[PDB]
Amino acid sequence: NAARWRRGKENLEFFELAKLLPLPGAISSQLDKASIVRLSVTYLRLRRFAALGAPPWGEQHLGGHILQSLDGFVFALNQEGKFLYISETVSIYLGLSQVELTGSSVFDYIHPGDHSEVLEQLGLQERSFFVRMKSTLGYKVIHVTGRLRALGLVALGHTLPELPLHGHMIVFRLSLGLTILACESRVSDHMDMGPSELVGRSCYQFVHGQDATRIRQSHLDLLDKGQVVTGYYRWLQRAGGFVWLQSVATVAHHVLWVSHVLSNAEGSQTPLDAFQLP
Template sequence: MAGSPLSLCVSNTHIHTLYPSAAPTQIVNLQNLRKEKSRNAARSRRGKENFEFFELAKMLPLPGAITSQLDKASVIRLTISYLHMRTFASQGDPPWSPLLEGDSNCSKGEQETGNHLKRKSLDGFVFVVSQEGRFLYISETVSIYLGLSQVELTGSSVFDYIHPADHVEMAERLGIRPHLRAEAGCHTAPESASSSASTSSLAGTPEPAPSSPHSPADDPPERGFFIRMKSTLTKRGLHVKSSGYKVIHVTGRIRCRPALVPGSTRSVRRPMGLVALAHTLPPSTLNEVRMESHMFVFRVNMDLQVTYCENR
């Protein structure tokens, strides 16, 4: 350890060996000089590293006000997600080309799909999930409906943000094989909030399901289902943030890529992930109910557990 009596003794002996006639003051000065050079070298390394992360953050397709405040872990996570999204766009069938104004390479179908997504996302949000269950992209409007940020969700596991009871449903829609669902954080039964928070993260990277007569690659690509996603929106009148869930209606398609079967010339379609639109269900407008003598009131939570019931 630096500064310990042993290291100081060895250092002094080494200096006396090199400079037999050196005075104690000179020895201290040499030690301080060595420490200063070490600090300068470490400061230089940190400066170069910060510069590389700064340059990398500027290349991300995000506003400068956001990239300038990202930490190093977020820069790496977002960069990996962006690279995966490029692969998702280019290797899928059909490949997506940039929808630039006056771009003659854009097909009419791509332009119509892009315009359709823009219109539909006005009252919801768009997201792309890889087959391993990670958000490759999610639109900024997610903050309006769930209170979660685009930067926070991008690159994270979708299973960290949906209700534990809906993990199996999401895994089935993505085509994750049953024996790999535990690695993706899927639970077959609802658990407490503390246990689900520690086990819902994506522990591994599930492999795509192989093409077979009953594989998800042969299923219709359209998807439509309901899940419960976390919401941190402030409840009106309470002025506190709730860690509850909102029911989301998801509609989309599984994006596939062509691939050759090993040892054969036959081509199959491998699922790459899900491109979807999400709409939150509107809140109930029912404020008053006429109570008859044979009726009673009770309240349940999202797990359908009774939290309140009238005495009658």
């Protein structure tokens, strides 16, 4: 009977705590007690986390433009792995709620078995890995790129990668071993080879020798998780030299290899490979 009054005062307080969260009225108002406390805690924790790190964090239309300008979501983990922040835009790509993830362990949303590798990346100083995350739109391959701090990750998640090609990007169709099956005739706008002189050979023949090992690791991740993004690598040209590419690749038991052309030819005098002679 006194418990009723005590709980009434507690409820009133929960209402207040909900009002003060940095959320829209319409969202915070519809929260339950447990989640009001969770968001309150991790939000104070977030304040602490941005306090640390250099600099301390801090035309006013800016943040809206930043968030809707990224093709992915932005997030910050603590040393444990709990989300201290995730941008509402996660809903665009994974359909998870920002309100649902905030305060939660990232591993509750990573495909298990990528758990080991993710645990390795946080240390449990740049980071860059591919991981499967829970999507409800039954996983999505998410490219994470960010920084570790020596104790918490700050990073961007981008879904991979409908098919809008533009001018400076050639499509390849490759086997699962990266031999060239088909090539856009457009390749000749950026390279010396035509689709006649490329089909039948393996991309490993065209990767500059210094990038063979990086491309290989990317090929591993491609067979492992189904999508991959290479680093900037060099593709050797028929005379000499190479053109720089970055490539996004997805499996369909065949491989789609979208190469953004990053530069014109470089050092085209000196040949490097056998196929560049005579």
